[PDB]
Design an enzyme around this catalytic site. Structure first.
Site, mmCIF file in Angstrom:
data_model
loop_
_atom_site.group_PDB
_atom_site.id
_atom_site.type_symbol
_atom_site.label_atom_id
_atom_site.label_comp_id
_atom_site.label_asym_id
_atom_site.label_seq_id
_atom_site.Cartn_x
_atom_site.Cartn_y
_atom_site.Cartn_z
ATOM 1 N N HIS A 266 61.294 38.051 32.677
ATOM 2 C CA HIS A 266 61.996 37.047 32.462
ATOM 3 C C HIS A 266 61.489 36.506 33.772
ATOM 4 C CE1 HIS A 266 66.071 34.851 33.163
ATOM 5 N NE2 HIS A 266 65.592 34.887 34.233
ATOM 6 N N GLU A 267 61.391 36.209 34.535
ATOM 7 C CA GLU A 267 60.560 35.774 35.861
ATOM 8 C C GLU A 267 59.075 35.032 35.593
ATOM 9 O OE1 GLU A 267 62.712 35.422 38.135
ATOM 10 O OE2 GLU A 267 63.786 37.052 37.873
ATOM 11 N N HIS B 294 60.500 31.707 34.497
ATOM 12 C CA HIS B 294 59.698 31.014 35.628
ATOM 13 C C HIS B 294 59.089 30.627 35.457
ATOM 14 C CE1 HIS B 294 64.341 31.426 35.139
ATOM 15 N NE2 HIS B 294 64.290 32.062 35.456
ATOM 16 N N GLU C 193 67.547 27.610 33.599
ATOM 17 C CA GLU C 193 67.770 29.278 33.641
ATOM 18 C C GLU C 193 68.051 29.948 32.057
ATOM 19 O OE1 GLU C 193 67.480 31.747 35.408
ATOM 20 O OE2 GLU C 193 68.076 32.618 33.998
ATOM 21 N N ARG D 282 71.409 42.072 27.982
ATOM 22 C CA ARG D 282 72.568 41.696 27.899
ATOM 23 C C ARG D 282 72.682 40.543 27.143
ATOM 24 N NH1 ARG D 282 72.462 38.215 33.504
ATOM 25 N NH2 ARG D 282 74.769 38.336 33.577
#
Ligand SMILES: [Zn+2]
Length: 1287
Positions: free
Chosen positions: A229-230, A233, A267, A369
């Site tokens: 996920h990072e 980014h 995001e 999630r």
């Protein structure tokens, strides 16, 4: 391929792959950090991230950094060489897992090759400048204790260990002079603070966590996904597309609203799934345009760059070739670079919509999630990621050899307990809201449990801007999607262009902006005397130091006394729960109360079909009192009246822009550039409709569906509190007994919990379906229509605009200005249907939508029902209803239209619903009771047609009228063409099933036919192919309009309209649902009543009636007299004849006034003999199959049964009822049913057969036969005098 290097923390510094680095935020001062090159351009520094943080802040305090994270603190993490080495080996393992699949290997390859541009906004177009903090980072070569020698290197990513909060991983970019190169196309060195062992935990609302409420719930994350996920980014930052734009900001004006940081589209894009849908198409395009504009600047630089002043060793050609491939620019045979729209679009979508958490999770079979907007749970600590028995490069936690692969069992907290450890709450910090009353009592509520409701400022108003339409003009759409499988198979996605050497000149300009962080109070005190969801949930808990509690239905007492716990379950459940019993009776009580809990929870499947509501959880209001005081009054009733809206805590103010005007530019003497301009303007109009719908969906998901999610979580908590409280009581009552007694008590606490938990799971499924239904309902009825209104207005303004444009160009267009004149009329005729799948591909959301559209009751666009002495529309679309003074209404939902001018109902329909599907498709249903003709007015009855319901607009529409015994449905298209279909009932029948009796009508219309159904059965059909457009949303007038007699009237009930064609099956079901009642009915179809005079009718002997025989106490059966005048049009048998009977109630001596007769009631069947009231009796000792009933004065004789039980053996709709004589109310001894029997009489003078009022056992077995025999002589009906029937 990607090569991951191996090394130990204690390996020697070699100034190549293991160095002493001077981090960007150190500003060239302070100490250096030992760094390890894990792959080209990527470094790992196994130490805490301290930049911008106070040393003491690494300790848990009364403060918090982030308002929405359960923060874990541990200042000792990474404080030893061995700990640093474990961090290193763990990062190595995670990178290996990441590259174990093509998708992750490609994410890494893109990051390694996405080298930052050599410079930023401040650098001249003709230069490459490596001497800036976002490009070069220094390494110390000299011996320890001196910085005498340093060297520069280019880098892409530097990963550090965590900052103060271990579980708050973050990717950081470098700003210089208030600007970020990573947000303006250049890209720049990216940094990250990451912790592999302390991972987040999540639980799925729509699902279950091993379905165990007594066990640990939820799933823990796979650190490899957390890292990816990072890395996404990082990817965005390296390509310079981590831009800022209009963010989603929470409304914080009310105490129940959740406070959090503004959320950037970058995001939600990074997360994927449904979240990109919260970013409107308007903003999607804004971001797209900014990035494209950024790339245009870079491509210009590649055409102008000539030298690199900072580093003479830099080969200009090598870098130009590398940046060309990085940004996918095209180069002609001369070396001129330019942007290729196709390649750019593909790159942009790959980076924003391809590499997402959701997509990666699916590919690696890792559970995560469902959305950024979901409650966060306490993190946990993985015991040992370096133990292949628990975690592997190939499968993570979900190891197939341990059968932890299916259903992500390896991540399930209830199943894989050996993989993690819980965290000591003493080290956790959470932002809470302290809600105090004006007294003083306060309640702490975690900020995460409040409602997230995006503020109106979160949404773009770009739709209000004007648009210039040119022959050039084209549509603009950004698909928030990217075929993941083609990304993985792309042959040119991953570069094959040489990666330049990393060594360069030392950095001497250390200018950089270093963020500064600080904790804020972990508790915010507010004042409110409101008792909403948070207080109601609180009243259902009890302190840990208390063990003896009792349940109560009083919310107030529950808050007051610590030993009192609130329960929203029944009065009986609560009483039984607080019951104290002897040891010998305890096991019985436990089984009883546990069973009661399940029954109470199961009421979540309650149906309310008569109100046109398939599902309703009646106790939600008592449980949470969420929204508009839903705990007071009757919730089902309140929901029937206002719907989903009553559950929302706050009604959002929606942004629904007035679409901007179109400016059409002419091209004189150019037939093509004009025709094109018109075509483009029409397509652009569709973009406006789509973008508008997208705006609505974004608001629905972030202001409405978020609230319903909170309610779902709330009900889960409420049900668990109820089970926990009961569990507490059971334990206490059991522990009051001695050991001797306990030994003989047969209780199994695990079976008890299994049964409570199962009951909860069943309830949660019901509740989730109910709330999801409410959410879609709000979107479709309270949001979409408001946008349609603005969109339709826009169409009108654009219509005249276009027609006038064609007008001003009539010459240049010549013989076609009319052809296109109609091109505008027909295109703007068909409006865009809303389809959620166009704005999202999230399975959960799509299924919710499809389910909604699969429910026929959601097609109801008008439903007139009685409520507090008035008729109102309960369809949810808000039609205005004006009931004038001459209309009579009663609580039985019946309304009467008379010959008076003020006996009228005016309905103004919602003009914003899809009714005009451009092919006719709708249905109308209602019950009606038409009075019998006046014998001396039969000519006018059969001749004069009068309208009863008219709905016309522009001389087009529909109408329902009546002409004597015929009811007619008429359609009229925009041209005036008319078509009719009717139902005529016979008026020469001895006994009519329709005259003056309630019957069900249903008319359906589709492109081919118009059909009329009566009581569920098809009666008539008319072909309506020739019929064109029929305007049906005009005003509806209910009024008798024609040449009618003053005495003329009509009764109606349950009027409703559906915007679709009902099937025979749908109609049959509606007939049965609307016919149902606990009471019996009379001949006319109204409720049967006690103390009301009735003549008796026999369905098996229609033309017969009962009369007390002159010489004997029996009822002889005679033949009904008949209509005697000479009219050739009518015939009927008299109904007001025979004895006048009256039903008296057996039970309760509440006198003899009046009341409703219900099925199974015990009664006395009496009748009037002159001034006396007699009764119907059965001689107790008859031995034959049947016998004559005994009619005599009221008295009590031991020789006669006098009590009857009124019944209804027919399962289908009927007005007939049966009368049974039982030995007594308690016994099962059936004497027989009341009916008619034929007897043979042979006297000295007359010989004949005669029928008599009797009781017979024969009927007992016959009424059990299927289908029910309507012709049975035991089927009776009660006929009271009625103004609608004169004879
Ligand atoms: Zn993120």
């Amino acid at each position: 391929p990607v090569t991951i290097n191996n090394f130990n923390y204690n390996d020697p510094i070699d100034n190549n792959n293991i160095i002493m680095m001077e981090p960007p935020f150190a500003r060239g001062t302070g100490r250096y950090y030992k760094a390890f090159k894990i792959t080209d351009r990527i470094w790992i520094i196994p130490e805490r991230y301290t930049f911008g943080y106070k040393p003491e802040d690494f300790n848990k305090s009364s403060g918090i950094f982030n308002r929405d994270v359960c923060e874990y603190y541990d200042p000792d993490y990474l404080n030893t060489n061995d700990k640093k080495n474990i961090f290193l080996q763990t990062m190595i393992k995670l990178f290996n897992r990441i590259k174990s699949k093509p998708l992750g290997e490609k994410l890494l390859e893109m990051i390694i090759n996405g080298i930052p541009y050599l410079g930023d906004r401040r650098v001249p177009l003709e230069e490459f400048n490596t001497n800036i903090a976002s490009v070069t980072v220094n390494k110390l070569i000299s011996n320890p204790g001196e910085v005498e020698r340093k060297k520069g290197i280019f880098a892409n990513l530097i990963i550090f260990g965590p900052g103060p909060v271990l579980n708050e991983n973050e990717t950081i970019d470098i700003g210089i002079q208030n600007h970020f190169a990573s947000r303006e196309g250049f890209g720049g060195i990216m940094q990250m603070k990451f912790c592999p062992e302390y991972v987040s935990v999540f639980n799925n609302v729509q699902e279950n966590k091993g379905a165990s409420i007594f066990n640990r719930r939820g799933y823990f994350s796979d650190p490899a996904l957390i890292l990816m996920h990072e890395l996404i980014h990082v990817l965005h930052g390296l390509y310079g597309i981590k831009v800022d734009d209009l963010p989603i900001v929470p409304n914080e004006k009310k105490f129940f609203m959740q406070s959090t940081d503004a959320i950037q589209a970058e995001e939600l894009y990074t997360f994927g799934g449904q979240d990109p849908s919260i970013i409107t198409p308007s903003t999607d395009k804004s971001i797209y345009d900014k990035v494209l504009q950024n790339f245009r600047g870079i491509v210009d630089r590649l055409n102008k760059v000539l030298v690199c002043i900072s580093d003479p060793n830099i080969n200009i050609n090598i870098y130009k070739n590398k940046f060309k491939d990085k940004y996918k620019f095209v180069e002609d045979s001369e070396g001129k670079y330019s942007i290729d729209v196709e390649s750019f679009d593909k790159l942009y979508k790959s980076l924003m919509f391809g590499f997402t958490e959701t997509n990666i999770a699916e590919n690696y079979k890792i559970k995560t999630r469902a959305s950024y907007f979901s409650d966060s749970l306490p993190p946990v600590k993985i015991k040992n990621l370096l133990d292949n028995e628990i975690y592997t490069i190939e499968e993570g936690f979900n190891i197939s050899d341990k059968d932890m692969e299916k259903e992500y069992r390896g991540q399930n907290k209830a199943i894989n307990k050996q993989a993690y450890e819980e965290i000591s709450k003493e080290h956790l910090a959470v932002y809470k809201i302290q809600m105090c009353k004006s007294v003083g009592i306060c309640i702490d509520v975690d900020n995460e449990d409040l409602f997230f409701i995006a503020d109106k400022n979160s949404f773009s108003d770009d739709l209000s801007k004007n648009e210039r339409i040119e022959y050039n003009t084209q549509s603009n759409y950004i698909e928030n999607d990217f075929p993941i499988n083609e990304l993985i198979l792309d042959t040119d996605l991953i570069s094959k262009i040489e990666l330049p050497s990393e060594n360069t000149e030392s950095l001497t300009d250390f200018n950089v902006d270093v963020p500064v962080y600080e904790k804020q109070p972990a508790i915010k005190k507010i004042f409110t005397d409101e008792n909403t969801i948070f207080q109601y949930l609180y009243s259902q808990t009890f302190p840990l130091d208390i063990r003896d509690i009792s349940l109560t239905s009083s919310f107030d007492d529950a808050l007051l006394f610590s030993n009192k716990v609130y329960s929203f379950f029944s009065m009986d459940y609560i009483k039984t729960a607080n019951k104290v019993v002897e040891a010998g009776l305890f096991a019985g009580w436990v089984k009883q109360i546990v069973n009661d809990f399940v029954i109470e929870a199961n009421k979540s499947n309650t149906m309310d079909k008569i109100a046109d509501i398939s599902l309703i959880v009646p106790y939600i209001g008592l449980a949470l009192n969420v929204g508009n005081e839903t705990a007071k009054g009757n919730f089902e009733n309140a929901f029937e009246i206002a719907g989903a809206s009553i559950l929302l805590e706050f009604i959002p103010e929606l942004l629904i822009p007035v679409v901007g005007a179109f400016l059409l530019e002419s091209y004189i003497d150019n037939k093509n550039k004009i025709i094109k301009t018109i075509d483009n303007a029409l397509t652009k109009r569709n973009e406006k409709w789509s973008d508008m719908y997208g705006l609505i969906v974004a608001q629905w998901l972030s202001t409405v569906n978020t609230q319903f999610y909170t309610i779902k979580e709330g009900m889960y908590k409420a049900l668990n509190y109820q089970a926990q409280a009961l569990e507490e009581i059971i334990k206490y009552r059991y522990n009051i007994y001695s050991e001797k007694e306990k030994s003989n008590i047969n209780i199994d606490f695990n079976d008890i919990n299994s049964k409570l938990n199962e009951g909860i799971n069943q309830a949660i499924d019901n509740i989730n379906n109910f709330i999801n239904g409410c959410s879609v309902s709000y979107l479709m009825k309270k949001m979409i229509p408001l946008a349609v209104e603005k969109l339709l207005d826009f169409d009108n303004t654009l219509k005249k605009n276009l027609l006038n444009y064609i007008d001003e160009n009539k010459l240049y267009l010549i013989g076609s200005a009319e052809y296109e004149k109609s091109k505008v009329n027909k295109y703007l005729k068909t409006i865009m249907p809303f389809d959620l799948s166009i704005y999202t591909n999230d399975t959960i959301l799509i299924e919710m939508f499809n389910k909604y559209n699969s429910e026929i009751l959601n097609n109801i666009i008008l439903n007139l029902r009685y409520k507090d002495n008035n008729l109102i529309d309960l369809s949810g679309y808000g039609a205005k209803v004006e009931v004038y003074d001459g209309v009579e209404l009663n609580d039985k939902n019946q309304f009467k239209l008379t010959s008076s001018a003020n006996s009228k109902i005016r309905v103004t329909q919602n003009q914003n619903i899809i009714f005009n599907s451009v092919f006719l498709d709708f249905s109308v249903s209602f019950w009606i009771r038409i009075p019998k003709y006046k014998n001396d007015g039969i000519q006018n009855y059969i001749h004069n047609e009068y309208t009863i319901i008219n709905c016309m607009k522009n001389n087009s529409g529909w109408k329902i009228s009546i002409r004597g015994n015929r009811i007619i449905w008429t359609l009229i298209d925009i041209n005036g063409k008319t078509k009719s279909v009717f139902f005529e009932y016979n008026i020469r029948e001895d006994i009519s099933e329709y005259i003056n009796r309630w019957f069900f009508v249903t008319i359906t219309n589709n492109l081919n036919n118009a059909k009329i159904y009566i009581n569920g059965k098809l009666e008539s059909n008319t072909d309506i192919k020739d019929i064109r457009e029929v305007i049906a949303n005009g005003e509806i007038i209910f009024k008798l309009d024609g040449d009618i007699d003053r005495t003329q009237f009509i009764w109606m009930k349950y009027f409703s309209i559906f915007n679709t064609e009902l099937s025979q099956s749908n109609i049959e079901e509606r007939y049965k649902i609307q016919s149902y009642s606990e009471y019996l009915k009379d001949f006319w179809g109204n409720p049967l009543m006690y103390n009301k005079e009735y003549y008796m009718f026999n369905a098996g002997n229609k033309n017969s009636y009962i009369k007390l025989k002159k010489d004997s106490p029996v009822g002889e059966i005679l033949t009904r007299s008949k209509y005697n005048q000479n009219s050739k049009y009518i015939n009927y048998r008299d109904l007001y004849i025979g004895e006048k009977f009256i039903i008296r109630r057996k039970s309760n001596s509440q006198s003899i006034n009046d009341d409703i007769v219900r099925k199974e009631d015990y009664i006395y069947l009496d009748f009037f003999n002159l001034n006396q009231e007699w009764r119907v009796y059965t001689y107790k000792y008859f031995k034959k199959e049947e016998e004559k009933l005994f009619l005599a004065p009221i008295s009590d004789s031991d020789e006669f049964y006098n009590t009857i039980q009124i019944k209804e053996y027919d399962e289908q709709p009927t007005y007939s009822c049966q009368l049974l004589f039982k030995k007594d109310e308690e016994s099962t001894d059936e004497i027989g049913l009341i009916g008619i029997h034929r007897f043979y009489e042979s006297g000295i003078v007359f010989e004949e057969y005669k029928d008599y009022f009797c009781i017979s056992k024969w009927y007992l077995k016959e009424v059990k036969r299927k289908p029910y025999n309507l012709k049975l002589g035991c089927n009776w009906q009660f006929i009271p005098k009625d103004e609608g029937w004169t004879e």
